[PDB]
Design an enzyme around this catalytic site. Structure first.
Site, PDB file in Angstrom:
ATOM      1  N   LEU A  21      43.217  39.008  48.963  1.00 21.13           N
ATOM      2  CA  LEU A  21      42.057  39.470  48.227  1.00 21.13           C
ATOM      3  C   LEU A  21      40.770  38.503  48.320  1.00 21.13           C
ATOM      4  CD1 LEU A  21      43.833  39.507  44.850  1.00 21.13           C
ATOM      5  CD2 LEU A  21      43.173  41.560  46.255  1.00 21.13           C
ATOM      6  N   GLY A  22      40.865  37.150  48.906  1.00 24.23           N
ATOM      7  CA  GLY A  22      39.915  36.306  49.162  1.00 24.23           C
ATOM      8  C   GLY A  22      40.436  34.907  49.575  1.00 24.23           C
ATOM      9  N   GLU A  23      39.306  33.864  49.772  1.00 24.11           N
ATOM     10  CA  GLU A  23      39.777  32.488  49.863  1.00 24.11           C
ATOM     11  C   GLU A  23      38.860  31.614  48.994  1.00 24.11           C
ATOM     12  OE1 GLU A  23      38.896  31.457  53.926  1.00 24.11           O
ATOM     13  OE2 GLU A  23      40.551  32.364  54.722  1.00 24.11           O
ATOM     14  N   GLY A  24      39.475  30.546  48.700  1.00 19.11           N
ATOM     15  CA  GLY A  24      38.717  29.329  47.850  1.00 19.11           C
ATOM     16  C   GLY A  24      38.425  28.106  48.688  1.00 19.11           C
ATOM     17  N   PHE A  26      40.145  25.661  48.130  1.00 16.75           N
ATOM     18  CA  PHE A  26      41.614  25.142  48.590  1.00 16.75           C
ATOM     19  C   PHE A  26      42.218  26.492  48.317  1.00 16.75           C
ATOM     20  CE2 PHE A  26      43.899  25.330  44.378  1.00 16.75           C
ATOM     21  CZ  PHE A  26      42.842  25.209  43.568  1.00 16.75           C
ATOM     22  N   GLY A  27      43.111  27.168  48.998  1.00 11.43           N
ATOM     23  CA  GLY A  27      44.192  28.035  48.896  1.00 11.43           C
ATOM     24  C   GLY A  27      43.320  29.360  49.266  1.00 11.43           C
ATOM     25  N   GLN A  28      44.261  30.481  49.330  1.00  9.58           N
ATOM     26  CA  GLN A  28      43.796  31.879  49.362  1.00  9.58           C
ATOM     27  C   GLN A  28      44.728  32.809  48.606  1.00  9.58           C
ATOM     28  OE1 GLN A  28      45.332  33.968  53.030  1.00  9.58           O
ATOM     29  NE2 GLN A  28      46.163  32.245  53.557  1.00  9.58           N
ATOM     30  N   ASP A 160      33.114  26.680  35.429  1.00  8.73           N
ATOM     31  CA  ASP A 160      32.240  27.551  36.195  1.00  8.73           C
ATOM     32  C   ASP A 160      32.392  29.296  35.711  1.00  8.73           C
ATOM     33  OD1 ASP A 160      30.714  28.711  38.150  1.00  8.73           O
ATOM     34  OD2 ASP A 160      32.381  28.976  39.704  1.00  8.73           O
ATOM     35  N   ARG A 164      31.818  36.914  37.726  1.00  9.62           N
ATOM     36  CA  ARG A 164      32.354  36.764  38.917  1.00  9.62           C
ATOM     37  C   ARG A 164      33.840  36.389  38.547  1.00  9.62           C
ATOM     38  NH1 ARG A 164      35.746  34.004  42.172  1.00  9.62           N
ATOM     39  NH2 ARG A 164      35.539  35.137  44.245  1.00  9.62           N
ATOM     40  N   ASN A 165      34.239  35.445  37.903  1.00 10.45           N
ATOM     41  CA  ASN A 165      35.408  34.923  37.545  1.00 10.45           C
ATOM     42  C   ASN A 165      35.961  35.446  36.349  1.00 10.45           C
ATOM     43  OD1 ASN A 165      35.617  32.910  39.460  1.00 10.45           O
ATOM     44  ND2 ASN A 165      34.054  31.595  38.673  1.00 10.45           N
ATOM     45  N   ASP A 178      40.850  31.824  36.977  1.00 12.92           N
ATOM     46  CA  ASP A 178      40.349  30.519  37.757  1.00 12.92           C
ATOM     47  C   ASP A 178      40.023  29.379  36.755  1.00 12.92           C
ATOM     48  OD1 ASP A 178      41.207  31.684  39.853  1.00 12.92           O
ATOM     49  OD2 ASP A 178      39.089  32.003  40.931  1.00 12.92           O
TER      50      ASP A 178
HETATM   51  C1  LIG Z   1      45.691  43.558  41.312  1.00  6.66           C
HETATM   52  C2  LIG Z   1      45.552  41.874  41.943  1.00  6.66           C
HETATM   53  C3  LIG Z   1      47.215  41.254  42.162  1.00  6.66           C
HETATM   54  C4  LIG Z   1      46.397  41.761  43.382  1.00  6.66           C
HETATM   55  C5  LIG Z   1      45.209  44.259  42.891  1.00  6.66           C
HETATM   56  C6  LIG Z   1      45.539  45.651  42.424  1.00  6.66           C
HETATM   57  N1  LIG Z   1      45.460  46.906  42.284  1.00  6.66           N
HETATM   58  C7  LIG Z   1      44.024  43.948  43.073  1.00  6.66           C
HETATM   59  O1  LIG Z   1      43.648  44.049  44.502  1.00  6.66           O
HETATM   60  N2  LIG Z   1      42.954  43.519  42.213  1.00  6.66           N
HETATM   61  C8  LIG Z   1      41.722  42.982  42.653  1.00  6.66           C
HETATM   62  C9  LIG Z   1      41.134  43.555  43.733  1.00  6.66           C
HETATM   63  C10 LIG Z   1      39.850  42.680  43.981  1.00  6.66           C
HETATM   64  N3  LIG Z   1      38.904  43.355  44.909  1.00  6.66           N
HETATM   65  C11 LIG Z   1      37.501  43.294  44.899  1.00  6.66           C
HETATM   66  C12 LIG Z   1      37.146  43.494  46.301  1.00  6.66           C
HETATM   67  C13 LIG Z   1      37.438  44.761  46.905  1.00  6.66           C
HETATM   68  N4  LIG Z   1      36.978  44.623  48.561  1.00  6.66           N
HETATM   69  C14 LIG Z   1      37.255  46.112  49.216  1.00  6.66           C
HETATM   70  C15 LIG Z   1      36.064  46.798  48.835  1.00  6.66           C
HETATM   71  O2  LIG Z   1      35.045  46.378  49.910  1.00  6.66           O
HETATM   72  C16 LIG Z   1      35.143  44.874  49.904  1.00  6.66           C
HETATM   73  C17 LIG Z   1      35.748  44.241  48.860  1.00  6.66           C
HETATM   74  C18 LIG Z   1      38.788  45.016  46.925  1.00  6.66           C
HETATM   75  C19 LIG Z   1      39.736  43.876  46.113  1.00  6.66           C
HETATM   76  C20 LIG Z   1      39.263  42.072  43.236  1.00  6.66           C
HETATM   77  C21 LIG Z   1      39.843  41.340  42.020  1.00  6.66           C
HETATM   78  F1  LIG Z   1      39.313  40.557  41.379  1.00  6.66           F
HETATM   79  C22 LIG Z   1      41.076  41.864  41.926  1.00  6.66           C
HETATM   80  N5  LIG Z   1      41.854  41.419  40.770  1.00  6.66           N
HETATM   81  C23 LIG Z   1      42.561  40.627  40.719  1.00  6.66           C
HETATM   82  N6  LIG Z   1      43.591  40.563  40.102  1.00  6.66           N
HETATM   83  N7  LIG Z   1      44.161  39.645  40.068  1.00  6.66           N
HETATM   84  C24 LIG Z   1      43.568  38.660  40.821  1.00  6.66           C
HETATM   85  C25 LIG Z   1      43.890  37.282  40.926  1.00  6.66           C
HETATM   86  C26 LIG Z   1      42.939  36.517  41.745  1.00  6.66           C
HETATM   87  C27 LIG Z   1      41.798  37.452  42.192  1.00  6.66           C
HETATM   88  O3  LIG Z   1      41.020  36.360  43.055  1.00  6.66           O
HETATM   89  C28 LIG Z   1      40.122  37.197  44.142  1.00  6.66           C
HETATM   90  C29 LIG Z   1      39.717  36.115  45.142  1.00  6.66           C
HETATM   91  C30 LIG Z   1      38.822  37.404  43.285  1.00  6.66           C
HETATM   92  C31 LIG Z   1      38.223  38.258  44.043  1.00  6.66           C
HETATM   93 CL1  LIG Z   1      38.678  39.200  45.328  1.00  6.66          CL
HETATM   94  C32 LIG Z   1      36.772  38.754  43.480  1.00  6.66           C
HETATM   95  N8  LIG Z   1      36.342  38.340  42.430  1.00  6.66           N
HETATM   96  C33 LIG Z   1      37.097  37.205  41.732  1.00  6.66           C
HETATM   97  C34 LIG Z   1      38.345  36.739  42.216  1.00  6.66           C
HETATM   98 CL2  LIG Z   1      39.191  35.468  41.313  1.00  6.66          CL
HETATM   99  C35 LIG Z   1      41.588  38.706  42.033  1.00  6.66           C
HETATM  100  C36 LIG Z   1      42.485  39.130  41.113  1.00  6.66           C
END
Ligand SMILES: *[C@@H](C1CC1)[C@@H](C#N)C(=O)Nc1cc(N2CCC(N3CCOCC3)CC2)cc(F)c1Nc1n[nH]c2ccc(O[C@H](C)c3c(Cl)cncc3Cl)cc12
Length: 300
Positions: A21-24, A26-28, A160, A164-165, A178
């Site tokens: 889903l992304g990076e931070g 620390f950790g991914q 924070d 976005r969080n 987070d």
């Molecule tokens: C449910 C989560 C267990 C994976 C899952 C489903 N179904 C999911 O993917 N949820 C989810 C997706 C996204 N995305 C947004 C970006 C998008 N990309 C594709 C289109 O073009 C480029 C972008 C698709 C994926 C964001 C999310 F926040 C979630 N939801 C989510 N659920 N649990 C999560 C735990 C951590 C988390 O962290 C990531 C790094 C994060 C992102 Cl990617 C964006 N904003 C905040 C955070 Cl904390 C996201 C989580």
């Protein structure tokens, strides 16, 4: 090699890692399938998020992730936060497993659901009616407030808080993410811009930015910013203001203007959250009750 906590421990072989889903710092974070997260249904499938060290992994990175894991355990479960589901600490890499929110973060949720402009042709009886309504926006704000109220009651400072969080579930439930991160408060790059153009300094309370002081009231400041995000439908705070100008404006007591199509009730709350004196800002308990009144008044 970490100590075993059978309460939270989950067999890593019951995880199937998927797309990252992304990076931070620390950790991914990686999307994954889990089997038998509920021990009563050992073969049932669920979608979860898995926090893990990168291969950048130093010991400080590991210490931070372990630190976050332990914070997760102690906070407990609440409807409006991203909850811990399990951990993997034995015979393999460290995994911190948390909940899935289907719709991404609150910022992109709102931006993708901005009403159609004057450019697209009318088609049907609802060509002017966008996905987002006022009571739902209030509900989003209310849920975040309740989530923060819970975190506060558990002695947790987010440091924070932003759209976005905040994550959005399939049923449009707000879940704060987070909240237990070691964010390196003594070395913050204030000019740092994220890959998606975010300047996190714009969410910092003045006492946090200038004095490195964090309280629950500093989170209240951030919540005021988040309020502005919501009713600008995912807009970036302090429009067109670089970090250098932000510093001097904040020292002059500058505040954001009332955004378009935003009732005075909610801009009032924003300004209250942005009072210079932290003690003159509302508590999250007061915010919850204030937002509840508005919510109940528009949910006939
Ligand atoms: C449910 C989560 C267990 C994976 C899952 C489903 N179904 C999911 O993917 N949820 C989810 C997706 C996204 N995305 C947004 C970006 C998008 N990309 C594709 C289109 O073009 C480029 C972008 C698709 C994926 C964001 C999310 F926040 C979630 N939801 C989510 N659920 N649990 C999560 C735990 C951590 C988390 O962290 C990531 C790094 C994060 C992102 Cl990617 C964006 N904003 C905040 C955070 Cl904390 C996201 C989580």
């Amino acid at each position: 090699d970490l100590p075993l906590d059978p309460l939270w421990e989950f067999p890593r072989d019951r995880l199937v890692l998927g797309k990252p889903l992304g990076e931070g710092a620390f950790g991914q974070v990686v999307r994954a399938e889990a089997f038998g997260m509920d021990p009563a249904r050992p073969d049932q499938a669920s979608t979860v998020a898995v926090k893990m060290l990168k291969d950048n992994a130093s010991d400080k990175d590991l210490a931070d992730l372990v630190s976050e894991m332990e914070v997760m355990k102690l906070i407990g479960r609440h409807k409006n936060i991203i909850n811990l589901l399990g951990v993997c600490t034995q015979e393999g890499p460290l995994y911190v497993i948390v909940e899935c929110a289907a719709k991404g973060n609150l910022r992109e949720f709102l931006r993708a659901r901005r009403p159609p402009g004057p450019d697209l042709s009318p088609d049907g009886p609802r060509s002017s009616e966008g996905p987002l309504s006022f009571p739902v926006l209030v509900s989003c704000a209310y849920q975040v407030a309740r989530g923060m109220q819970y975190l506060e009651s558990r002695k947790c400072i987010h440091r924070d808080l932003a759209a976005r969080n905040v994550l959005v579930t399939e049923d449009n439930v707000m879940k704060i993410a987070d909240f237990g991160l070691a964010r390196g408060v003594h070395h913050i790059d204030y000019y740092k811009k994220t890959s998606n153009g975010r300047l996190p300094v714009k969410w910092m309370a003045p006492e946090a930015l200038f004095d490195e002081v964090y309280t629950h009231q500093s989170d209240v400041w951030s919540f005021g910013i988040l309020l502005w995000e919501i009713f600008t439908l995912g807009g970036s705070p302090y429009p067109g203001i670089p970090v250098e100008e932000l510093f001097s404006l904040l020292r002059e007591g500058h505040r954001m203007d009332r955004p378009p199509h935003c009732p005075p009730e909610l801009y009032g709350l924003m300004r209250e959250c942005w009072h210079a004196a932290p003690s003159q800002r509302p508590t999250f308990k007061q915010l919850v009750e204030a937002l509840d009144k508005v919510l109940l008044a528009v949910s006939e």
